[PDB]
């Protein structure tokens, strides 16, 4: 359509005004004395949020030129959100500081590209320093402290995650779900569980548990449909003659087959449970091989050329116990050899390192976890749904932070870590004066998260900043108790991944915005 | 679209204005001197309501920022409505009081999050105190008193429910329906009744009752269709030879089968009634097993491998009498063993405790009630439909209150109970001054339901509040007779569930609203 | 109630206490205290109170029974 072009300072002023609008909404949610932002949803009740990425996504400014600036800073919150779950507000606050100070240098006549080169040079140097200050976190105490800080000082959320990471293991996956009651709960399942029910209720040999339990069973894994008992016969003769209970895995079971199985179980000839294969296509086939590796069995398929009629009792895996519900199937403790399990785990794990789809990478993480370790779900307890949504976001942020803390270690929280790295990098210079100004613009911006937390508390940011900078190592301000002290001892610990990610993403988006000469946008 | 962002006090003032608009409409309907609210319906006549949840749902404020506040307080009325049917006005009145007082503390410079932590601490402590003051209600007198208070001082509604709960039993379900006439009626059915009619009118052996009655019959339960008499023959020979009347249950009956049955009954060979199975799918199958457990019979199905042709007279259950209409089927007094009935009831009852769908939980409640106890329907009598709708809402509220009263006991009504708990909790303090202010904001809000009932009466709320607080135990004001006295003796009793639910839901929604810093909403 | 409202206290509680009290018991807004008003020194002439009530009622009566008002056009 018709395009209106604005040039020079006029474009930059409108661009900054939009950045300032989005940043101001995100800024109010920083630190513990930070307040919530309410986002109207067109259908349903308004959502009260303290997560910056949610606030940033919703805000679209009406003015065309101003909106373009707001959309560009929305990228830092989203990118930080994706790479490491928390750090979305710190990233936006750092980005706003670099743009505001950088625009002043452009007004002073500094070459914008030279400033961008200096800001990148300072950003790279700070990342190396943050790696040096990083201290590895593996102890439960540190995991609980990072969880509590990520959940806005919620100790219960921190300890629940520390306990869960305890039981599930490094391979194990922890998940967040809406809770049944006011109280938070943690459910951990070890062994092979998957979300498929009993085919008929007639198999129920524990009607007081509402379920089927089978003691030391053989397990049969079949490709395609079980069309008839006519395929099944020699295996049925063999298993019955041996005497053990049995679990039938197949992609479906036909009426003749299911009805005959019910007649045999009911009248006592063979003790048999029948369940459906999990998911669809290639991942169903893959998970069936993983189930076979766990049981120490063979997958019967047409591709390998295995008739169901030519299977024997050597070709069935085994487990210590199996338990099955109307929704869920679970297997306790395989006969599969541990070395074979680890070879198959190593295969699956190597494909995680190749996983372009993050959504499917999670599904690969579940397959490793079911084979080795356990999957836990955290019930999020709230009186009302509005409280449930904010409750879950805090729990999710804590799980994301705890995972990053194990991966890259921990550094002092409260923005003390960035104040420390800027102090170390003071002499870092650049080829030209404009690069030197760019290095300083980035160094001054690093103080902005600390100042904003203190401003949200109601303390004057300048006085606290100077005291913290004067102090050395982990000396910092506890915003909650409004007292100075050692941050790591006080328990204000934040991951080195979230701190580094926020700096890198903020610098990237900010450097491009300072260089902008003209803005082209559709006519109002 | 374009979003307008308001920050700080400007956002909170607009947010409070919306809360005040919704609350004011709900407030007029509190207590016995409370007046009705009329809600225009776009098609049909306007609805006159005294239930707050209905008024809250309809109100949507035109101003975008104000509407967001109104939508958020609509949650407390709806949530209280769902968990326990009554208490929707008390919840909204408490929520408005906490928000108005809490916003003043935020204006005084109190940390909003610290206030929320204190309000939650006071809310938890009060709930424990309300459990202590709770006195269990099981006597008919108390059940009638809670029913009368819930129906806005309607004694007839209270006694009808006391009598109904009497006959149906704890397992029994009481239901509310539009009444045939000006007078309210109560119909209680014991035994196995279900809503399916006679297949043909030719079976009518009582044409002066318009119906079929069969004395000491065998009952046959079949899966699928009865296709032919060719399946039926050996059972028909056996039953006729034995000589007893018979009731045929199946999912359908084909023309050849139905016509042959009519020929046999008409000409006197066998006395047989035929009826269709209730509902569809799995719950039809489940209810057919429950019917078999009651009759002391066997369900004939393909899954168990039971041919209709291979059934015998040992495989049929029996009842003392059966009676059937054009709409409804009812069975009087089974031959099924009581211990087997209780085992099957225990199975069904255990699945109630697992029931995620509340709608289907009610359907599980009916199945327990048909097997043990009875289902009653209360006819709601009114001259006009407008009066019918308000009449039924009061009857429904009384049934919800009576159910809660048996479950969690009763405490003094009129808001005297909350005044009492606040007085006990006066010393409860918090870690910081802001938490202490938050505890007091909640303690002062607890007086608001008592004050609003008195204000609706036209009495000045302040004077009565002070007299009630000065009095001890159940000393309280009877708003109707405008006289002070013992509330439990006066008969103003309300459930401990409804009182506790109103406090918990109000505190949850209110605490989040006080913390709001900014509001983002679509441009007008 | 207006004397009490202007001083920032609750009109209803003070009005009830004075109403319940006997004779000159009343609330001195200045000292924020209730006492015998004659002793406390808050004395007003009888004519002042009688005249106020009589004149106020007269305007109220004319007010209630006014059936027309004629004014010049804006
Ligand atoms: N009690 C505290 N005292 C000082 N700093 C804190 C405290 N709690 C959290 N912080 C720090 O404030 C920041 C938390 O910001 P937050 O509100 O969680 O959003 P985001 O991390 O996305 O910026 C982190 O740097 C954290 O270490
Ligand atoms: N005659 C009465 N005297 C004093 N309090 C009463 C009387 N009747 C009902 N109440 C109390 O007023 C409240 C009833 O409010 P209601 O109009 O039924 O709507 P809701 O319960 O949803 O707030 C209860 O606390 C009840 O105990
Ligand atoms: Mg965070
Ligand atoms: Mg009510």
Residues of A in contact with B347 (CB under 8 A): 207-208, 210
Q: Quote the CA–CA distance of A30 and A457 in Å, as a whole number.
A: 9
Q: Quote the CA–CA distance of A109 and A237 in Å, as a whole number.
A: 90
Residue entry with tokens 């986002």: A39
Task: Name the CATH code of domain B1-134+410-524 (choices 3.30.70.20, 1.10.357.10, 2.40.30.40, 1.10.560.10).
Answer: 1.10.560.10
Specify whether the CB–CB gap between B513 and B99 falls below 8 A.
yes
Residues 6+ apart with CB under 8 A from A12: A103, A106, A516
Beta strands in B388-509 (DSSP E): 410-412, 475-478, 483-486, 493-495
Residues 6+ apart with CB under 8 A from A343: none
Give domain A135-192+367-409's CATH architecture. Answer: 2-Layer Sandwich (3.30)
Residues of B in contact with C16 (CB under 8 A): 460, 463
Residue entry with tokens 């052996």: B205
Residue B208 is classified by DSSP as T
DSSP per-residue letters across A42-53: SSSSPEEE--HH
For chain B, the helix, strand and coil percentages under 3-state DSSP, each to the nearest 5: 55, 20, 25
Residue B198 is classified by DSSP as B
Q: For residue A473, is it left (φ>0), alpha (ψ between -120 and 50) or beta? A: left
In this complex, how many residue pairs, one in chain B and one in chain C, have their CB atoms less than 8 Å apart?
Answer: 10
DSSP per-residue letters across A393-424: HHHHHHHHHHHHHHHH-EEETTTHHHHHHHHH
Q: How far is the CA of A387 from the centre of ligand 3 (A)?
A: 17
Q: Quote the CA–CA distance of B6 and B63 in Å, as a whole number.
A: 13
Q: How was this structure determined?
A: cryo-EM
Known binding residues of C: 28-30, 44
Q: C11: nearest CA in chain B?
A: B462
Q: What is the dihedral of CA B235, B236, B238, B241, to 10 degrees?
A: 170
Residues written for chain A = 524
CATH 3.30.260.10 residue window(s) in chain B: 135-192+367-409
Pairing of strands A317-324, A218-222: antiparallel
Burial label, A147 (beta-carbon count in 10 A; 0-12, 13-18, 19+): buried
Beta strands in B171-316 (DSSP E): 173-178, 185-190, 192-194, 212-215, 218-222, 225-226, 246-250, 252-253, 272-276, 299-300
Task: Choose among B65, B520, B74: nearest CA to A39.
Answer: B520
Residue entry with tokens 């609750």: C10
Residue C69 is classified by DSSP as -
Question: Which residues, numbered 16 to 55 in chain C, qualify as contacts with chain B under a Cβ-Cβ cut-off of 8 Å?
Answer: 16
Specify whether the CB–CB gap between A27 and A452 falls below 8 A.
yes
Q: Quote the CA–CA distance of B335 and B343 in Å, as a whole number.
A: 16
Q: B464: nearest CA in chain C?
A: C13
Q: How many helices (H) and strands (E) does chain C have?
A: 4, 2
Pocket around ligand 1: residues whose beta carbon is below 6 Å from it?
Answer: A 29-32, 34, 52, 86-90, 149, 153, 413-415, 453, 478-480, 492, 494
Task: Choose among B430, B393, B371: nearest CA to B119.
Answer: B430
Residue A314 is classified by DSSP as G
Q: Quote the CA–CA distance of B176 and B157 in Å, as a whole number.
A: 11
Q: Quote the CA–CA distance of B353 and B340 in Å, as a whole number.
A: 21
Q: Quote the CA–CA distance of B237 and B269 in Å, as a whole number.
A: 10
Residues 6+ apart with CB under 8 A from B354: A210
Task: Choose among A257, A205, A255, A256: nearest CA to A236.
Answer: A257
Q: Quote the CA–CA distance of B512 and A33 in Å, as a whole number.
A: 14
Give the 3-state DSSP-derived string for B21-55, with helices as H, strands as E and coil as C.
Answer: HHHHHHHCCCCCCCCCEEECCCCCCCEEECCHHHH
Specify whether the CB–CB gap between B405 and B493 falls below 8 A.
yes
The protein residue whose alpha carbon is closest to atom 6 in ligand 1 is A414
> Angle B338-352/B358-371 helices, nearest 10 degrees?
170
Specify whether the CB–CB gap between A516 and A16 falls below 8 A.
no
The protein residue whose alpha carbon is closest to atom 14 in ligand 1 is A31
3-state secondary structure of A381: coil
Q: Which atom of ligand 1 is nearest to the CA of A150?
A: 18
Residue B491 is classified by DSSP as T
Specify whether the CB–CB gap between A49 and A29 falls below 8 A.
yes
Q: Quote the CA–CA distance of A237 and A307 in Å, as a whole number.
A: 16
Token pair listed for B73: 């307080």
Give the CA angle between residues B160, B30, B62 to the nearest 5°: 125
Pairing of strands A173-178, A252-253: unpaired
Specify whether the CB–CB gap between B367 and B373 falls below 8 A.
no
Q: Any CB–CB contact under 8 A between B515 and chain A?
A: yes
Token pair listed for A265: 């179980």
Continuous segment of H or E residues that includes residue A300? strand A299-300
Alpha helices in A296-432 (DSSP H): 338-352, 358-371, 385-408, 416-424
CATH 3.50.7.10 residue window(s) in chain A: 193-366
Chain B: closest CA distance from residue C12 (Å): 7
Token pair listed for B265: 């009954």
Backbone torsions φ then ψ of A126, nearest 5 degrees = -65, -40
Specify whether the CB–CB gap between A294 and A192 falls below 8 A.
yes
Q: Quote the CA–CA distance of A483 and B285 in Å, as a whole number.
A: 67
Q: Quote the CA–CA distance of C34 and C13 in Å, as a whole number.
A: 12
Give the CA angle between residues A180, A186, A190 to the nearest 5°: 120
For residue B153, give Cα distances in angstroms to B60, B448, C16.
31, 22, 29
Q: Residue B401 half-sphere exposure, CB side, CA atoms within 13 Å?
A: 32
Task: Choose among B143, B201, B205, B32: nearest CA to B407.
Answer: B143
Task: Choose among A222, A348, A239: nearest CA to A275.
Answer: A222
Backbone torsions φ then ψ of B176, nearest 5 degrees = -115, 130
Q: Which of the ligands is closest to the CA of residue B399?
A: 4
Q: Quote the CA–CA distance of B265 and B258 in Å, as a whole number.
A: 11
Token pair listed for B180: 């045939």
Query: Which residues face B410 on adjacent strands?
Result: B135, B495
CB contact under 8 A, A25 and B1: no
The chains in contact with chain A, meaning 3 or more Cβ pairs closer than 8 Å, are B
Q: Which atom of ligand 2 is nearest to the CA of B29?
A: 17
Question: Which residues, numbered 443 to 462 in chain B, qualify as contacts with chain C under a Cβ-Cβ cut-off of 8 Å?
Answer: 460-462
Burial label, B209 (beta-carbon count in 10 A; 0-12, 13-18, 19+): exposed
Q: For residue A333, is it left (φ>0), alpha (ψ between -120 and 50) or beta? A: left
Q: B460: nearest CA in chain C?
A: C12
Backbone torsions φ then ψ of B437, nearest 5 degrees = -65, -40
Continuous segment of H or E residues that includes residue A485? strand A483-486
> Angle B448-457/B416-424 helices, nearest 10 degrees?
150
Backbone torsions φ then ψ of A415, nearest 5 degrees = 80, 5
Is A50 marked as binding a ligand?
yes
3-state secondary structure of B155: helix
Q: Quote the CA–CA distance of A201 and B32 in Å, as a whole number.
A: 53
Task: Choose among B319, C25, B515: nearest CA to A386.
Answer: B515
Backbone torsions φ then ψ of B402, nearest 5 degrees = -65, -40
Query: Which residues face A493 on adjacent strands?
Result: A412
Give domain A193-366's CATH architecture. Answer: 3-Layer(bba) Sandwich (3.50)
What is the gyration radius of the CA atoms in chain B, in angstroms? 29
Residues of B in contact with C18 (CB under 8 A): none
Token pair listed for A332: 């306790």
Q: Residue B296 half-sphere exposure, CB side, CA atoms within 13 Å?
A: 14
Q: Quote the CA–CA distance of A48 and A55 in Å, as a whole number.
A: 10
Q: Which of the ligands is closest to the CA of residue B418?
A: 2
In this complex, how many residue pairs, one in chain A and one in chain B, have their CB atoms less than 8 Å apart?
Answer: 123
For residue A41, give Cα distances in angstroms to A27, A81, A177, A384, B318.
21, 21, 22, 17, 59
What is the gyration radius of the CA atoms in chain A, in angstroms? 29
Residue entry with tokens 């002092």: A412
Residue entry with tokens 């259950």: B317
For residue B508, give Cα distances in angstroms to B96, B123, B341.
12, 9, 44
Task: Choose among B147, B72, B192: nearest CA to B495.
Answer: B147
For residue B24, give Cα distances in angstroms to B3, B325, B445.
29, 51, 16
Q: How far is the CA of B478 from the centre of ligand 2 (A)?
A: 10
Q: Quote the CA–CA distance of B491 and B137 in Å, as a whole number.
A: 12
Q: Give how far the C-alpha of residue B88 lies from the chain's centroid of Cα atoms, to the nearest Å.
A: 14
Q: Quote the CA–CA distance of A405 and A165 in Å, as a whole number.
A: 12
CB contact under 8 A, B303 and A202: yes
Q: Which of the ligands is closest to the CA of residue A146?
A: 1
Give the CA angle between residues C37, C39, C42 to the nearest 5°: 45
Is B373 marked as binding a ligand?
no
Continuous segment of H or E residues that includes residue B503? helix B496-515
């Amino acid at each position: 359509a018709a395009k209106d072009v604005k040039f020079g300072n006029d474009a930059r002023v409108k661009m900054l005004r939009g950045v300032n609008v989005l940043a101001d909404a995100v800024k109010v949610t920083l630190g513990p004395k930070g307040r919530n932002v309410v986002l109207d949803k067109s259908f349903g009740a308004p959502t009260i949020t303290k997560d910056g990425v949610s606030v940033a996504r919703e805000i679209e400014l009406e003015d065309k030129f101003e909106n373009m600036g707001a959309q560009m800073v929305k990228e830092v919150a989203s990118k930080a959100n994706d790479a490491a779950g928390d750090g979305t507000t710190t990233a936006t606050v750092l980005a706003q500081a670099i743009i505001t100070e950088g625009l002043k240098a452009v007004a002073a006549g500094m070459n914008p590209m030279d400033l961008k080169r200096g800001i990148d040079k300072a950003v790279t140097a700070a990342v190396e320093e943050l790696k040096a200050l990083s201290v590895p976190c593996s102890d439960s105490k540190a995991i609980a402290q990072v969880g509590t800080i990520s959940a806005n000082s919620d100790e219960t959320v921190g300890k629940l995650i520390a306990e869960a990471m305890d039981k599930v293991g490094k391979e194990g996956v922890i998940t967040v779900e809406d809770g049944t009651g006011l109280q938070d709960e943690l459910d951990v399942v070890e062994g092979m569980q998957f979300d498929r029910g009993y085919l008929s209720p007639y198999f129920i040999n524990k009607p007081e548990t509402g379920a089927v339990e089978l003691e030391s069973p053989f397990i049969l894994l079949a490709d395609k449909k079980i069309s008839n008992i006519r395929e099944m016969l020699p295996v049925l003769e063999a298993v019955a003659k041996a005497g053990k209970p049995l679990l039938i895995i197949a992609e479906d079971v036909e009426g003749e087959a299911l009805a005959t199985l019910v007649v045999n179980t009911m009248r006592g000839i063979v003790k048999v449970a029948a369940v459906k294969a999990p998911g669809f296509g290639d991942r169903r086939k893959a998970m069936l091989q993983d189930i076979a590796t766990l049981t120490g069995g063979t997958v019967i398929s047409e591709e390998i050329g295995m008739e169901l009629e030519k299977a024997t009792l050597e070709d069935l895996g085994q487990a210590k116990r199996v338990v099955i519900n109307k929704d869920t199937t679970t297997i306790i403790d395989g006969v599969g050899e541990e070395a074979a399990i680890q070879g198959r785990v190593a295969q699956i794990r190597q494909q995680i390192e190749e996983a372009t789809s993050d959504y499917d990478r999670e599904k690969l993480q579940e397959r490793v976890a079911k084979l080795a370790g356990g999957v836990a779900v955290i019930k999020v307890g709230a009186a009302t749904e509005v409280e449930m949504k904010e409750k879950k976001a805090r729990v999710e942020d804590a799980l994301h932070a705890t995972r990053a803390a194990v991966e890259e270690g921990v550094v002092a929280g409260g923005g003390v870590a960035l104040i420390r790295v800027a102090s170390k990098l003071a002499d870092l210079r650049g080829q030209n004066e404009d690069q030197n100004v760019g290095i300083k613009v980035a160094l001054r911006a690093m103080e902005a998260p600390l100042r904003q937390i203190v401003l949200n508390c109601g303390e004057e940011p300048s006085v606290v900043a100077n005291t913290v900078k004067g102090g050395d190592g982990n000396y910092g301000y506890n915003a909650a108790t409004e007292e100075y002290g050692n941050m790591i001892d006080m328990g204000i610990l934040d991951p080195t991944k979230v701190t580094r990610s926020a700096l890198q993403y903020a610098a990237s988006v900010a450097g491009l915005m300072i260089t902008t000469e003209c803005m082209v946008t559709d006519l109002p």
